[PDB]
Design a protein around this ligand. Structure first.
Ligand SMILES: *[C@@H]1O[C@H](CO)[C@@H](O)[C@H](O)[C@H]1NC(C)=O
Ligand SMILES: *[C@@H]1O[C@H](CO)[C@@H](O)[C@H](O)[C@H]1NC(C)=O
Ligand SMILES: *[C@@H]1O[C@H](CO)[C@@H](O)[C@H](O)[C@H]1NC(C)=O
Lengths: 99, 50, 38, 49, 49, 41, 49, 99, 99
């Protein structure tokens, strides 16, 4: 009541209060049974790429997207993501992926 | 989907093409657990205000 | 109560005038040591 | 805070970015209230061989 | 059920608290309306047989 | 509750049973006492 | 690093200045030269930034 | 039924809540309507403005509901004052007032 | 414990002003709660967003202060109309109305 009314003194009556009593202390993460590595080598390390007039669309599915494996071999000059931050990308699932 | 709330058993049927279930548009209410396909609906961490 | 459970006050069968309105026909007051009664 | 990186990793300095520098080497806090000053130094740091 | 719940309460709880105080005043106003209309004389008499 | 995004309804302090009791008392007093009901005894 | 490498592989020196603003007494300031103080007058003031 | 006037009040109450929850349906020009989606998809520094926009729309909805409740409470208070006048002047005593 | 109504009015006014101060103390999603700070350390074209965020947040807080004053003034008007009707009937005349 002192926190909700923002005052040390509280007058006689009944007061509705905001929830400060419960603070969580555990974290659970549930993600599907996927362990195969995504074919990042095929879409990043191919000898031949199609031109811009016919851009090549590749479906990515049924795998786990670990972006770290890409740090060692290559470095990306531009990495700009819209709608999703570069952070929390590894903590977040993706429904439909086309490269 | 990230959140802080109580999880309880759901008796709501889900069609195969849909994953989440929002009773009110603003808040997600139910989810399909990925490892076990049983439906799990999310009740708030706090109940009705004391 | 019909409004909900009350913990922290003692229920008495005697009826007095309402001081703090709990609701659903229940009220609370500070009376005699001294304690909150519903 | 002074260090030396590559050209591609300069964008990794900015807060909210991910990379080999951001995750494992140097991470700006989300609410950074400061400046980042980067300049090319091919004549000084780089040497033949 | 947001992750950063306490920060949201700290930044935006007093505004909602004022609105909830207004709604509680509405509820007390309607209760007092019932008390004024129905409870005018507090004497209770048995129904005649 | 959760479905109304936190909008709950508060039950009134005067329940329908006590309201019916108040109306029964008013009817009994109006029939049996005239206008001497509210003036004390 | 090699001097014949591309612009992405050339060295870049990065200095990150981190500072807190208007929450503490200041030990470092800018190029603005201080003027005389005026008391009890409606005037534009710049006190410690 | 000539009693449906009170029904109107009940219906009006329900109608207000219906409109209120419809106001929770809109995202108020944000990325997503759901709070948790905005928390999960974006890093916090991009997310303060989106959270501010979304819950500011929600709080404006609550304020508008408060104003509508106050209008209907003024009408109900006027009707209750009239009914209490009928209680004091006609039930308890005889009224010479016409009509 | 007599005279509780007048003391309740005074405490309600004090609580309304205190809640106004506590709402106004919030930063309303801006960089800093102080307007002078975000004039001093931010150039105007991107500063205007923080300006009107903080300012409209403060103004909205006044709106809810105004509406709380409105419902309190409605209750006070009900009590004052009761008092005026009593001064017209109880004091300057004899009322047959019971209780
Ligand atoms: C790409 O292929 C080359 C040649 O096999 C290899 O040396 C390099 O390590 C590969 N990079 C990745 C993505 O593993
Ligand atoms: C995932 O694997 C674990 C361990 O074998 C198993 O217990 C669980 O049921 C699996 N879930 C599925 C089938 O998606
Ligand atoms: C009040 O009356 C109830 C009737 O069920 C009884 O059970 C209870 O013990 C009484 N309480 C007392 C002793 O005041």
């Amino acid at each position: 009541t002192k926190c909700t009314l923002k005052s040390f003194t509280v007058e006689k009556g009944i007061y509705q209060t905001s929830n400060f009593r419960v603070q969580p202390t555990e974290s659970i993460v549930r993600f599907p049974n996927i362990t195969n590595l995504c074919p990042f080598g095929e879409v990043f390390n191919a000898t031949r790429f199609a031109s811009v007039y016919a851009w090549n669309r590749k479906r990515i599915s049924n795998c786990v997207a670990d972006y770290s494996v890409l740090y060692n071999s290559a470095s990306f000059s531009t990495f700009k993501c819209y709608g999703v931050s570069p952070t929390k990308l590894n903590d977040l699932c993706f429904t439909n992926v086309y490269a | 989907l990230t959140g802080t709330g109580v999880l309880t058993e759901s008796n709501k049927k889900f069609l195969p093409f849909q994953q989440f279930g929002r009773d009110i548009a603003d808040t997600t209410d139910a989810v399909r657990d990925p490892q076990t396909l049983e439906i799990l609906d999310i009740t708030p961490c706090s109940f009705g205000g004391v | 109560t019909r409004a909900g459970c009350l913990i922290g006050a003692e229920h008495v069968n005697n009826s007095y005038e309402c001081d703090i309105p709990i609701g659903a026909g229940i009220c609370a007051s500070y009376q005699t040591s001294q304690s909150i009664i519903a | 805070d002074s260090f030396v990186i590559r050209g591609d990793e300069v964008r990794q300095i900015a807060p909210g970015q991910t990379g080999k520098i951001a995750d494992y080497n140097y991470k700006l806090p989300d609410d950074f209230t400061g400046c980042v000053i980067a300049w090319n130094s091919n004549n000084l740091d780089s040497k033949v061989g | 059920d947001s992750t950063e719940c306490s920060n949201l309460l700290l930044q935006y709880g007093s505004f909602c608290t004022q609105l909830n105080r207004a709604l509680t005043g509405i509820a007390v106003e309607q209760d007092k309306n019932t008390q004024e209309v129905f409870a005018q004389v507090k004497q209770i008499y048995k129904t005649p047989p | 509750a959760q479905k109304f995004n936190g909008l709950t309804v508060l039950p009134p302090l005067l329940t329908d049973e006590m309201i019916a009791q108040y109306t029964s008392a008013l009817l009994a007093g109006t029939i049996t006492s005239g206008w001497t009901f509210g003036a004390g005894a | 690093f090699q001097p014949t490498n591309g612009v992405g592989y050339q060295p870049y020196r990065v200095v990150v200045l981190s500072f807190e603003l208007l929450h503490a007494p200041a030990t470092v300031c800018g190029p603005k030269k201080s003027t005389n103080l005026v008391k009890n007058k409606c005037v534009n003031f710049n006190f410690n930034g | 039924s000539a009693l449906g006037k009170l029904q109107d009040v009940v219906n009006q109450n329900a109608q207000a809540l219906n409109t209120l929850v419809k106001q929770l349906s809109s995202n108020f020009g944000a990325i997503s309507s759901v709070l948790n989606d905005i928390l999960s998809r974006l890093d916090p520094p991009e997310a303060e403005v989106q959270i501010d926009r979304l819950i500011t729309g929600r709080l404006q909805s609550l304020q508008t509901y408060v104003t509508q409740q106050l209008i209907r409470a003024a009408e109900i208070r006027a009707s209750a004052n009239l009914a209490a006048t009928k209680m004091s002047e006609c039930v308890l005593g005889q009224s010479k007032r016409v009509d």
